[PDB]
């Protein structure tokens, strides 16, 4: 029988190659499908499936009227089941994924079989058809299934189709169709009347993006999200990989075959050996009643019962605009004719930056670009970076604009995410910072507001699931005569790896010495009393330009200082974050980059950090204005020891095309 | 320099380098008399960008200062970040030479000895050979302190360590040197529980840092 339109929208049809093979599957996550492995095998119906890109260009069609078409990019097959998870080029909107069953199937249970395979009469139906199956037995990694009646059957081309169990008006995923006698099916000898079938069980595997207390993640298993995958390898090594196919984080527990990863009732996440007793790795957290969740934003975070982050792996790519697993950068370009547009430079596989593409090109008079500040970050929880603009208006009012990132690397039209009547906030006093301060899986905005009376307050604008911002609230504050705005150079990042971004300030201490404060983020998104993590009198504050990022892949961010020497030369000193004797601080500074005198002018180039080659370690790239007016991109990648490599040249242009002083890059912290 | 009163004179400089040349963070230094001229001098195992190892020697001037360095040994087969150089006369030549303790990714470690020699009038270190090796997991290079010297007084320098064991016990080991600069098996010496000697709370008097 045919399925009523709008039903089982989560059920997808797959087309492999140039109509070479037919296969079915089900939506499991916004950007993931679950399909049969046998249809992607070199030998159809049996044998191994290649990991990574499929052997043939493959697409899938799904939705209530099968009106949505998406491409499958990457396969990660399982070895003990006819099951492969396929990553999509883009997430599917408007279609709800099917959750995994949390209980075992049992004999006598009725399962609903739906797919796009051949029917009793139709070789290649244009709609979904279903069948009623009953469980006969459950063992190993498969189910023994038969028909509820002798009228229907599972037929060729329907492989990979979901077998659903109805519960509370909804459905749960129990198994995918695999092999059968296909009795009574079109194109099959009528002599065969059996509809007995065997399918892999999907109830005894990890799924979704969360681990509950007591949950166990078996080897050759994984959790998935839009911008990351968490998997435990057969060799016992628990790893997280990006959409680029590269590993961002690992426990390093390789060679311990049979090792298992589990989330304990104590709230910690650990890796245990084959003996079920010996611990090979632990997050060493405490959070009873908590859970471990792999976010769409990118990273893996362990949260307590109150929803507060306790620990994070830090497996994220900052301002990745297309979601391809590598950091990008973008700029707001003001043309001399009054019009403006946003240009995006995508990261390449070698860490270089490709030629920019433009988007959101608007006419003169649309924006009054005299008093605006630019922010970047993922403000929707998409898994791809967005942008935002904080702008003042001639009536003294303020608005905060947000533009969502597109899959093609461009941006959509900005929309107002927050606004205030004049007399509330003033653009001249606000100093916004982007990052995830709340730890809710969406970036938000913090403002260091300097009052005319000399007082200071930190305001936080948390993000909603609508992409909009809530009303600002204050937390940390200081009396007038204490903190001076003119002496504050601020950066942001997650400096202790607690899953929440926070502030740090390089303060000019009277004699132009440098003292670094950190302002840890509260569970409520606010900020706590600062403490000093680093200080030095060996360097002049007026010549320091601090930057933040994870420059050794620790999972916790740290800082470097670009220093402009009187000699005409410059260098970067990196201070890695570490905890010693229970005390958090930055370690001793070392020179990681240096140039000859006169080789670079710090006032003629714009800086932006990020993970450009997607190797899990943050690095920095610049657009520098050369003596002849030429603008050139350089990227210095980070070595495992936080030493930088030589700069790699990327896109460049004459001043006749790109004017240096007329463009501003979207950043995470000002200057 | 030292006086006959046991006191030191005012310091004076000799060799120097401009900024942007030698980076302190990439310098692992040892000292000894590497050409047998009767004066001790410096040598540096420098991390050459890609973490390869290049060894410089800084011969001592008659006035106690140091002269322009020259390269005595280089190899790209070993990772600088895993090398801990030591100096001494490990074959009784009368002129000091160096060995490198190497911490492998495999969990094992070894010592490679490069004996000092003069060939065609040119001073350099000879080809490296493995003189000591251990099973994987047998020793942790970050849990033990090293010190070289001639412990049995046979004229050939050798090395001994105080290693911190998994159970907190601290144990002394000495590996004596054979005439061919091969090491013998380690000989156990004094040992104690952590309740008596705390490993991380004691520092040995050395001739060169780390
Ligand atoms: C003249 C002056 O002091 N203007 C104030 C402020 O000056 C700074 C500041 O904008 C920073 C950061 O944006 O950039 C430069 O350092 C500016 N310096 C100079 C010399 O221009 O600029 C703001 C501003 O919004 O540019 C002024 O506020 C005014 O402009 C806004 C936006 O266009 C709007 O037009 C307001 O009506 C106008 N505000 C007032 C009160 O006249 C700052 N003004 C004051 C009075 O503090
Ligand atoms: C400015 C520029 O072109 N820099 C190049 C870059 N270094 C930095 C510091 O950015 C690399 O090394 C080049 C080289 O030294 O080959 C530099 O080029 C030149 C021409 O000196
Ligand atoms: C650490 C330790 O006790 N080392 C002993 C030492 N070797 C090294 C490399 O120091 C000798 O040979 C012993 C053996 O192998 O008899 C080692 O003991 C054990 C117990 O393996």
B97 Cα–ligand 3 center, Å: 26
SS3 A55: coil
- The CA–CA distances, whole Å, from A297 to A314, A442, A494, A651 equal 11, 7, 15, 28
- Torsion angle (degrees, nearest 10) of CA A521, A522, A525, A526: -80
Pocket of ligand 2 (CB under 6 A): A 595, 599-600, 634, 646-647
- Cα A224 to Cα A230: distance, rounded to the nearest angstrom: 6
- φ and ψ of A143, to 5 deg: -115, 145
What do you get for the CA distance between the two ends of chain A, in Å? 64
SS3 A662: helix
For residue A455, how far is the Cα from the chain centroid?
37
Neighbours of A539 (CB within 10 A): 16
Strands (E), A17-141: 21-29, 32-35, 58-62, 68-77, 84-88, 110-115, 129-139
Strands (E), A91-214: 110-115, 129-139, 142-147, 162-167, 170-176, 179-180, 197-200, 210-211
Contact status, residue A269 vs residue A255, Cβ threshold 8 Å: no
* Partner-chain contact A569 B20, CB within 8 Å: yes
- φ and ψ of A309, to 5 deg: -65, 140
Contact status, residue A604 vs residue A623, Cβ threshold 8 Å: no
- Cα A317 to Cα A248: distance, rounded to the nearest angstrom: 9
User: What is the DSSP code string of chain B?
Assistant: -B-TTS-B----------TTSS-GGGEEEEEE-SS-SS--EEEEEEE-SSS-EEEEEEPBPTTS-B---EEEEEESSS-GGGEEEEEE-SS--SS-EEEEEEE-TTS-EEEEEE-EEEETTEEEE---EEEEE--TTS--TTSEEEEEE-SS-SSS-EEEEEEE-TTS-EEEEEE-B-TTS-B---EEEEEE-TTT--GGG-----SS--
Contact status, residue A403 vs residue A246, Cβ threshold 8 Å: no
Q: Which residues contact A545 (CB under 8 A, 6 or more apart)?
A: A489, A561, A562, A563, A564, A602, A607, A671
Contact status, residue B169 vs residue B193, Cβ threshold 8 Å: yes
- φ and ψ of A461, to 5 deg: -110, 100
- Cα A91 to Cα A109: distance, rounded to the nearest angstrom: 33
- The CA–CA distances, whole Å, from A140 to A58, A69, A105, A112, A201 equal 31, 35, 12, 21, 9
Q: Which two tokens stand for residue A245?
A: 């196919």
User: What is the DSSP code string of A222-233?
Assistant: EEEETTEEEEE-
- Cα A304 to Cα A299: distance, rounded to the nearest angstrom: 16
Neighbours of A476 (CB within 10 A): 18
Contact status, residue A400 vs residue A459, Cβ threshold 8 Å: no
Contact status, residue A342 vs residue A331, Cβ threshold 8 Å: yes
Residue of A102, A263, A667 whose CA lies nearest to A431: A667
Q: B63: burial class by Cβ within 10 Å (0-12, 13-18, 19+)?
A: exposed
* Residue whose structure tokens are 């097959």: A77
Give ∠ CA A366-A367-A373 in degrees, rounded to 5.
Answer: 160
Contact status, residue B102 vs residue B110, Cβ threshold 8 Å: yes
Determine how β-strand A444-450 pairs with β-strand A456-461: antiparallel
Pick the residue of B18, B21, B22, B23 with the most A CBs within 10 A to test the interface with A by mutation: B23
- Cα A56 to Cα A18: distance, rounded to the nearest angstrom: 8
Contact status, residue A443 vs residue A379, Cβ threshold 8 Å: yes
Contact status, residue A472 vs residue A433, Cβ threshold 8 Å: no
SS3 A348: coil
Contact status, residue B145 vs residue B204, Cβ threshold 8 Å: yes
Ligand 3 pocket, residue B134 CB under 6 Å? yes
* Residue whose structure tokens are 């081309």: A157
Q: A248: burial class by Cβ within 10 Å (0-12, 13-18, 19+)?
A: buried
Give ∠ CA B34-B37-B39 in degrees, rounded to 5.
Answer: 75
- Cα A317 to Cα A326: distance, rounded to the nearest angstrom: 6
* Residue whose structure tokens are 């009536």: A395
Which chain A residue is nearest to residue B82, measuring alpha carbons?
A: A641
Ligand 3 pocket, residue B186 CB under 6 Å? yes
For residue A349, how far is the Cα from the chain centroid?
18
Contact status, residue A40 vs residue A77, Cβ threshold 8 Å: yes
Helices (H) and strands (E) in chain A, counts: 0, 51
Pick the residue of A643, A644, A645, A646 with the most B CBs within 10 A to test the interface with B by mutation: A643
Contact status, residue A176 vs residue A199, Cβ threshold 8 Å: yes
* Partner-chain contact B19 A590, CB within 8 Å: no
- Cα A39 to Cα A55: distance, rounded to the nearest angstrom: 11
Q: Which two tokens stand for residue B150?
A: 């001639």
* In A382-435, alpha helices (H): none
Give all strands of the β-sheet with A531-536 in edge-to-edge order.
A488-493, A502-508, A514-519, A531-536
Give ∠ CA B22-B48-A553 in degrees, rounded to 5.
Answer: 105
Instruction: Check the CA dihedral A282-A286-A292-A298 and report its sign.
Output: negative
Residues of A in contact with B23 (CB under 8 A): 591, 594
- Cα B122 to Cα A262: distance, rounded to the nearest angstrom: 62
Residues of A in contact with B166 (CB under 8 A): none
SS3 A15: strand
* Residue whose structure tokens are 């297309």: A322
Q: Which residues contact A143 (CB under 8 A, 6 or more apart)?
A: A105, A135, A137, A174, A175, A198, A199, A200, A201
Instruction: Kindly provide the b/e burial profile for residues A280-291, where b requires at least 16 CB atoms within 10 angstroms of the residue's own CB.
Output: bbebebebeebb
Pocket of ligand 1 (CB under 6 A): A 370-371, 392, 394, 396, 427-428
- Cα B15 to Cα B11: distance, rounded to the nearest angstrom: 13
B201 touching A, CB under 8 A? no
Q: B2: burial class by Cβ within 10 Å (0-12, 13-18, 19+)?
A: exposed
Q: Please, which residues bridge with residue A547 across strands?
A: A560
Q: Please, which residues bridge with residue B88 across strands?
A: B97
Q: Which two tokens stand for residue B92?
A: 């009784």
- φ and ψ of A424, to 5 deg: -85, -80
User: What is the DSSP code string of A627-643?
Assistant: TTS-EEEEEE-B-TTS-
* Residue whose structure tokens are 């330009």: A545
- φ and ψ of B193, to 5 deg: -70, 160
Residue of A344, A303, A304, A300 whose CA lies nearest to A326: A344
Q: Please tell me the number of Cα atoms within 13 Å of A603 on its side-chain side.
A: 5
A514 Cα–ligand 1 center, Å: 29
DSSP at A542: G
Give ∠ CA A483-A486-A488 in degrees, rounded to 5.
Answer: 65
Which chain A residue is nearest to residue B81, measuring alpha carbons?
A: A641
A169 Cα–ligand 2 center, Å: 65
Give the method of determination. cryo-EM
- The CA–CA distances, whole Å, from A446 to A462, A527, A602 equal 8, 10, 27
Contact status, residue A324 vs residue A612, Cβ threshold 8 Å: no
- The CA–CA distances, whole Å, from A658 to A335, A362, A631, B194 equal 10, 17, 7, 66
- The CA–CA distances, whole Å, from A112 to A8, A63, A135, A148, A166 equal 10, 18, 11, 10, 8
User: What is the DSSP code string of A214-275?
Assistant: T-EE-SSEEEEETTEEEEE-TTS-EEEE-TTS-EEEE---TT-TT-EEEE-TTS-EEEE-TT
Q: Which two tokens stand for residue A57?
A: 């260009």
Instruction: Kindly provide the b/e burial profile for residues A614-632, where b requires at least 16 CB atoms within 10 angstroms of the residue's own CB.
Output: bbbbbbbbbbbbbeeebbb
- Cα A417 to Cα A395: distance, rounded to the nearest angstrom: 19
Q: Please, which residues bridge with residue A46 across strands?
A: A43
- Torsion angle (degrees, nearest 10) of CA A85, A90, A94, A95: -10
What radius of gyration do chain B's Cα atoms show? 18
Chain A with chain B: Cβ pairs closer than 8 A: 13
Contact status, residue B43 vs residue B98, Cβ threshold 8 Å: yes
- Cα A134 to Cα A112: distance, rounded to the nearest angstrom: 9
* Partner-chain contact B19 A591, CB within 8 Å: no
What do you get for the CA distance between the two ends of chain B, in Å? 23
Contact status, residue A315 vs residue A494, Cβ threshold 8 Å: no
Strands (E), A322-455: 329-334, 340-345, 357-362, 372-377, 386-392, 398-403, 415-420, 432-435, 444-450
Determine how β-strand A11-16 pairs with β-strand A58-62: antiparallel
| Closest CA to ligand 3's atom 11 | B186
Residue of A440, A638, A612, A447 whose CA lies nearest to A558: A638
Contact status, residue A154 vs residue A130, Cβ threshold 8 Å: no
* Partner-chain contact A569 B23, CB within 8 Å: no
- The CA–CA distances, whole Å, from A187 to A32, A113, A154, A556 equal 32, 20, 13, 60
**Helical (H) or strand (E) element with A574:** strand A570-575
B105 Cα–ligand 3 center, Å: 20
Contact status, residue A623 vs residue A631, Cβ threshold 8 Å: yes
User: What is the DSSP code string of A102-115?
Assistant: SS---TT-EEEEEE
SS3 A560: strand
A636 Cα–ligand 2 center, Å: 11
- Cα A237 to Cα A310: distance, rounded to the nearest angstrom: 22
Instruction: Kindly provide the b/e burial profile for residues B124-137, where b requires at least 16 CB atoms within 10 angstroms of the residue's own CB.
Output: bbeebeebbeeeee
* Partner-chain contact A591 B23, CB within 8 Å: yes
- Torsion angle (degrees, nearest 10) of CA A177, A179, A180, A185: 70
Q: Please, which residues bridge with residue A508 across strands?
A: A514
Residues of B in contact with A591 (CB under 8 A): 23, 25
- φ and ψ of A487, to 5 deg: -110, 10
- Cα A641 to Cα B51: distance, rounded to the nearest angstrom: 10
- Cα B32 to Cα B152: distance, rounded to the nearest angstrom: 20
A278 touching B, CB under 8 A? no
């Amino acid at each position: 029988p045919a399925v009523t339109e709008g039903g089982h929208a989560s059920t997808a049809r797959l087309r492999i190659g140039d109509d070479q093979r037919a296969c079915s599957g089900v939506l499991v996550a916004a950007q993931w499908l679950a399909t049969a492995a046998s249809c992607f095998a070199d030998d159809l119906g049996a044998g191994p499936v290649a990991a990574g890109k499929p052997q043939w260009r493959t697409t899938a069609v799904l939705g209530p009227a099968a009106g949505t078409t998406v491409e499958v990019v990457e396969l990660v097959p399982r070895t003990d089941r006819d099951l492969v998870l396929a990553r999509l080029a883009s997430p599917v909107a408007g279609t709800t994924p099917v959750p995994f069953a949390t209980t075992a199937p049992a004999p006598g249970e009725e399962l609903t079989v739906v797919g796009f395979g051949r029917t009793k009469e139709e070789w290649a139906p244009l709609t979904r058809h279903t069948a009623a199956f009953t469980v006969q037995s459950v063992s190993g990694t498969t189910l023994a299934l038969d028909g509820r009646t002798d009228d229907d059957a599972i037929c060729a081309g329907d492989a990979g189709g979901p077998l659903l169990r109805q519960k509370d008006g909804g459905f749960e995923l129990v198994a995918l169709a695999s092999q059968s006698w296909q009795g009574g099916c079109w194109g099959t000898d009528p002599a065969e009347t059996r509809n007995d079938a065997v399918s892999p069980r999907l109830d005894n595997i990890a799924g979704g993006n969360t681990l509950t207390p007591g949950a166990v993640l078996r080897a050759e298993d994984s959790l998935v999200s839009n911008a990351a995958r968490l998997t435990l390898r057969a060799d016992g090594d628990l790893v997280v990989v990006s959409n680029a196919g590269k590993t961002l984080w690992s426990t390093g527990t390789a060679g311990h075959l049979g090792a298992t990863a589990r989330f304990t009732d104590s709230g910690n996440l650990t890796v245990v050996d084959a003996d079920g007793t010996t611990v090979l790795w632990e997050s060493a957290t405490t959070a009873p009643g908590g859970s471990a969740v792999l976010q769409d934003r990118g990273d893996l975070v362990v949260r307590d019962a109150q929803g507060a982050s306790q620990w994070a792996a830090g497996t994220e790519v900052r301002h990745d605009y297309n979601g391809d697993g590598r950091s990008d950068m973008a700029a707001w370009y003001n043309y001399t004719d009054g019009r403006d547009a946003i240009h995006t430079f995508l990261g390449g596989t070698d860490g270089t930056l490709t030629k920019p593409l433009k988007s959101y090109d608007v006419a003169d008079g649309v924006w009054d670009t005299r008093a605006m500040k630019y922010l970047t970050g993922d403000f929707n929880g998409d898994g791809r970076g967005d942008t935002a603009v904080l702008k003042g208006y001639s009536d003294t009012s303020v608005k905060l604009w947000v533009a969502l990132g597109r899959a093609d690397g461009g941006f959509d039209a900005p929309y107002t995410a927050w606004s205030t009547p004049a007399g509330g906030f003033h653009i001249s006093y606000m100093t916004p910072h982007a990052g995830d301060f709340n730890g809710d899986g969406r970036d938000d905005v913090a403002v260091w507001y300097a009052y005319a009376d000399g007082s200071t307050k930190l305001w936080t604008f948390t993000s909603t699931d609508r992409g909009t911002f809530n009303a600002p609230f204050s937390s940390w504050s200081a009396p007038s005569g204490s903190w001076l705005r003119s002496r504050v150079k601020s950066v942001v990042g997650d400096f202790d790896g607690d899953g929440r971004d926070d502030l740090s300030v390089f303060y000019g201490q009277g004699d132009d010495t440098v003292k670094t404060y950190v302002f840890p983020a509260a569970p409520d998104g606010g900020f706590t009393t600062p403490a000093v993590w680093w200080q030095s009198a060996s360097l002049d504050w007026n010549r320091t330009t601090p930057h933040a990022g994870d420059f050794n892949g620790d999972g916790r961010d740290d800082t470097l200082v670009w220093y402009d020497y009187p000699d005409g030369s410059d260098k970067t000193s990196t201070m890695l974050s570490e905890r010693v004797s229970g005390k958090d601080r930055f370690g001793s500074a070392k020179v990681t980059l240096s140039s000859p005198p006169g080789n670079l002018d710090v006032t003629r180039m714009q800086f932006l950090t990020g993970d450009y080659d997607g190797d899990g370690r943050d690095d920095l790239a610049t657009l520098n204005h050369q003596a002849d007016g030429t603008v050139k991109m350089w990227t210095w990648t980070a070595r495992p020891d936080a030493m930088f490599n030589g700069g790699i040249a990327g896109w460049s242009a004459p001043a006749s095309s790109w004017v240096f002083g007329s463009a501003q890059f979207f950043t995470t912290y000002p200057k």
